[PDB]
A paper describes a structure:
Inhibitors of the viral enzyme HIV-1 protease (EC 3.4.23.16) are important components of Highly Active Anti Retroviral Therapy (HAART) for HIV/AIDS. HIV-1 protease is a homodimeric enzyme in which the active site is located at the subunit interface, with each subunit contributing one aspartic acid to the catalytic center. The active site is covered on the top by two flaps, which become ordered into a closed conformation whenever a substrate or inhibitor is bound in the active site. During virus maturation, HIV-1 protease cleaves viral polyproteins at nine different sites of varying amino acid sequences.
Residue numbers in the entry: 1 to 99, 1001 to 1099
């Protein structure tokens, strides 16, 4: 299946005998699921995201059926606001990003030019919005708060911002704030015709 990003890329998964919905998230290294019942041993672990950090339980060798496709790997269980299927499992179902074709064995980083500056950013299908590290942008902005896996952060919202993503031009909203990594979200990914394929 190929999938566009005009809507969040949700898939049905089966894990631990239970059926759940999860977001295919190219910006996540790991798979993180809402608190749920899984059998077996686990190790305490700490992961980060926008907002800060959360403690999770790490289960290994977990079988998961993602949109019918089987994969086995590490699954983290904790207080995430949404169930996320990260690259550790996306590579097993042969997921690719298309806009060039991009595989997910490494983080999908691209070079962007915005506000006259060159930066690197992560193509993130799990992000509704585009969020960049503090930087100098011209013009008016509006205060806004956004959430992520570890809580929330305050950002500055700039609209009608031109960005060149891997050579492709797009114009849209860009949030600027304390994100640990520059993220290109669906609002811009749709403009460069990015598709998720597996
Ligand atoms: N949506 C991503 C945004 C993100 C990517 C990479 C970093 N980092 O290297 O520091 C921070 C934020 C996200 O929240 N990714 C998390 C998801 C949880 C996980 O995979 O463990 C991440 O840790 O990659
Ligand atoms: N990597 C994603 C994980 C995520 C997706 C959706 C929600 N949610 O609807 O509540 C929470 C976590 C991520 O960090 N998404 C953030 C990125 C920042 C942004 O786009 O505003 C999100 O808010 O979607």
């Amino acid at each position: 299946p190929q999938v566009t990003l005009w809507q969040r890329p949700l898939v049905t998964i089966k894990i631990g005998g239970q059926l759940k919905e999860a977001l295919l998230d190219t910006g996540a290294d790991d798979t993180v699921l809402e608190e749920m019942s899984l059998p077996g041993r686990w190790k305490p672990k700490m992961i980060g995201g926008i907002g800060g950090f959360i403690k999770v339980r790490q289960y290994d060798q977990i079988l998961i059926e993602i949109c019918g496709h089987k994969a086995i790997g590490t699954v983290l269980v904790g207080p995430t606001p949404v169930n996320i299927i990260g690259r550790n499992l996306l590579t097993q179902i042969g997921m690719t990003l298309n806009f060039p074709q991009v595989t997910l064995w490494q983080r999908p980083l691209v070079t962007i030019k915005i506000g006259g500056q060159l930066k690197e950013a992560l193509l993130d299908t799990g992000a509704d919005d585009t969020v960049l590290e503090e930087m100098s942008l011209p013009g008016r902005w509006k205060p806004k708060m956004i959430g992520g896996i570890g809580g929330f952060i305050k950002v500055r919202q700039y609209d009608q911002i031109l960005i060149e993503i891997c050579g492709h031009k797009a114009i849209g909203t860009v949030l600027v704030g304390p994100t640990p990594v520059n993220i290109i979200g669906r609002n811009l990914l749709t403009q460069i015709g990015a598709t998720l394929n597996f």
